[PDB]
Design a protein around this ligand. Sequence first.
Ligand SMILES: Nc1nc2c(ncn2[C@@H]2O[C@H](COP(=O)(O)OP(=O)(O)O)[C@@H](O)[C@H]2O)c(=O)[nH]1
Ligand SMILES: [Mg+2]
Length: 290
Amino acid sequence: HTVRAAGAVLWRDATVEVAVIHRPRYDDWSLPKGKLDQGETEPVAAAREIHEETGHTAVLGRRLGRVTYPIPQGTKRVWYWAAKSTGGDFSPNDEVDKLVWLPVDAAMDQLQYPDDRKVLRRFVKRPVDTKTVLVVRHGTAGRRSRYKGDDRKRPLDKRGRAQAEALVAQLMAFGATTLYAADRVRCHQTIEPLAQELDQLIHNEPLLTEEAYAADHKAARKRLLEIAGRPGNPVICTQGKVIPGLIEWWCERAKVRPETTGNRKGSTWVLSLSDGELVGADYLSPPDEK
Ligand SMILES: Nc1nc2c(ncn2[C@@H]2O[C@H](COP(=O)(O)OP(=O)(O)O)[C@@H](O)[C@H]2O)c(=O)[nH]1
Ligand SMILES: [Mg+2]
């Protein structure tokens, strides 16, 4: 059987230091990580494990690939994120008795596991003090054909509504702060629960609908870079025939290679930017899909 896990390179600005944790049961030094709970997404699990093992709050940024290791019951697969500390503090807990803060070169020597060192090498290979644009395909909204009315008004269905609620923890894990939706009800409804969590308004985006993108993709590209250039971490909720075009165009331009890809309803692209440059493009499946 395969156990799904998530973890992080937790870092702080002391000037970058990374957190290495000591687990006395095994007596080893490692990166924070643990198993996904039922219905949990990998990012939410990574943030939860950071808090349980380190005592810190953090904001996730770039994804740092995946580690696979054999366990008695089979295989454990761990997706890792860069995570900037935003608060809290370390007190000994059930898993961890010691935490050190080390510069990367010293952390490399401290780590027990070769695959943790590989994660740390990926961490240092690109900027970590990044801002984040979260491009979300709206949740499930039934069929165009079976809808009676202006399709622009077609609402999320029950599943899509549940996806919208499950995206709050997802997007909050990346420190979402500002909200944008294409001019379709199903796009606005997808981030309505996050708007309620942040107490922030959603900015309507007529250029980012399927019809507008089809007729003027250059206006859509320009609007995306404008939103991305503003302070904060924006969520942009749009449609299936817009997202691949925008993501592939930015990735090709920046020479960024996505490790995963897809376009499902309720999916998220985490676009990591440093000084205006795309440095990561991480596709996250919908919160209710593997
Ligand atoms: N190869 C490798 N083994 C690990 C790692 N982390 C834990 N283990 C080992 O895998 C087994 C299960 O530990 P772990 O996955 O941490 O689960 P838990 O301790 O049951 O929560 C133990 O034998 C650990 O020593 C790792 O990062 N790489
Ligand atoms: Mg383990």
